[PDB]
Design a protein around this ligand. Sequence first.
Ligand SMILES: CCCOc1cc(Cl)cc(-c2cc(-c3c[nH]c(=O)[nH]c3=O)cn(-c3cccnc3)c2=O)c1
Lengths: 301, 303
Amino acid sequence: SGFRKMAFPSGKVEGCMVQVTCGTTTLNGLWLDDVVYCPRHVICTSEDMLNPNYEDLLIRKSNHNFLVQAGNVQLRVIGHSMQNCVLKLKVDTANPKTPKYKFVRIQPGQTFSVLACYNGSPSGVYQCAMRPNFTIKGSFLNGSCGSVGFNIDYDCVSFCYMHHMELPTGVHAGTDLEGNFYGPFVDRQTAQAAGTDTTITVNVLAWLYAAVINGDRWFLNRFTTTLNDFNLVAMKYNYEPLTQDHVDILGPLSAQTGIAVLDMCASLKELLQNGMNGRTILGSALLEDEFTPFDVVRQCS
Amino acid sequence: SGFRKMAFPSGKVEGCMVQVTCGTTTLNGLWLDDVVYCPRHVICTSEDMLNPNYEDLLIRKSNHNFLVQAGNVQLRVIGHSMQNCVLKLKVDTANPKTPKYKFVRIQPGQTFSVLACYNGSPSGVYQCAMRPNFTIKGSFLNGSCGSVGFNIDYDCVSFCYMHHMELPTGVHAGTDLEGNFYGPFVDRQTAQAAGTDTTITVNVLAWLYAAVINGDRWFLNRFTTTLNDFNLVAMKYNYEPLTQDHVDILGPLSAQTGIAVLDMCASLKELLQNGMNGRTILGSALLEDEFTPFDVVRQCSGV
Ligand SMILES: CCCOc1cc(Cl)cc(-c2cc(-c3c[nH]c(=O)[nH]c3=O)cn(-c3cccnc3)c2=O)c1
């Protein structure tokens, strides 16, 4: 029993974190086999921030300009290449702690663990969801760039996020490990703002199923809804559309609890109308949308 | 920017988790140096659980009765002993992944990271506070006994919690690594309930400071109070008394903010009657009390 934002054990990723320095700029890199991945803005300077030409900046660098440190060991850079917004530094030694891993690009609504790091040294681990507006709501200070997000279903680490920047509203933007940004963001200091965010409806429903699994039914009701009528109401609260895909994905949790998906949708409609009237659900006084259906199944059974 | 509940990186502890099997019972052990620590109820059968005689159950057992698995490697037990509610299994090999560590006993209101494990394999990590009623609000299923809680200071792991049981209300109870229970609980399958919980006042204030540091300021006001007046309202709402040591600990945040504790208690005083009813601080509709002042400083400074 209990239900918590539960991160993956971070050890497999801790052994991959290194420090990358160019001039006065130091951030984190990810050391997998004989490659170190880091944000390409490690090669910018102060006057480079608004409109850096990364191709022109990189061509002027020699390998010895990159100082890569793994704990106390200095890693020798023997080559480099830029892929989208990620720099790939070939180093002269393969990381002996490299886990089984893959790179995946996730969709909005998916969750992952963030290993926040400074100077190549991990400081904390926590869960994040990719918001519908392609930001994440993390906790990052200066020097955290190059921290990564990952899942570890099975014993394979799936890297899905590398942290690049904090936007004006305090939320965070980054890339996949192929260097493609999530969302419309670019790695330069020009004015950028996240779009209006919305609530991840399928995740709220998954969390309500988690509440039922854990023994709480107070928010259910005797009503059902059509998928169309549910979406018409939920969008008035800035909720994301619920698709037939989402309804299919919730099938297993519906089966375990005996509550049809569209019956849980009717519960959510009433919760948006009424609020919680002094009650909580799984310890929260708001509707939680950063647990996926997969997360609920991972944690509840 | 941002403020999140963050656990310590768990790698130093992952390398210490093993599986301990006694008959049909399998749970998790902590392998440090050449000893494996686990809950003593691993030696009970279902019928023993109702009213166990642990020193008699332990007398009946021998080294060969304990099956200890580290990954795919079997560890040989060469000795066994009990310390309070923890079993100590001497093995023939020192864990080469043993971190610098010590055993500590934490105080209510203090936080730690939990590494939830099943069959000796780490499964998830999250932060917990030791509640005033000596429970923790974790997330644990059958097979999680022997999972541990810990803090990290530089390179030294301070182990503070070993998981033993889930109470009827769904909250969790355990021991320190010397086998002493937190709270008025016993390791027997019997009706037990934690006392009425209370809210950790100094942590709520710490979290209000975190909210200010992050631009959330609508709860600030011009007023101030004193301990006696606040503690009087704290009592009414089931909040822990606020001591002078608490005010001292929040000193740094009062400075770096311009809000005096009793000024903030006046803020908190106000929130306790009028309240939330929907509105939010740091994205929460309720007053969060599982962040310590150091959690706030540690996180809002990059340590
Ligand atoms: C849209 C407006 C923001 O524009 C950009 C654009 C770009 Cl390309 C980078 C950055 C940025 C750089 C650094 C950084 C610089 N120099 C270093 O030595 N180490 C660093 O880490 C850090 N953080 C940051 C701060 C707090 C939390 N998370 C990330 C950043 O956002 C911001």
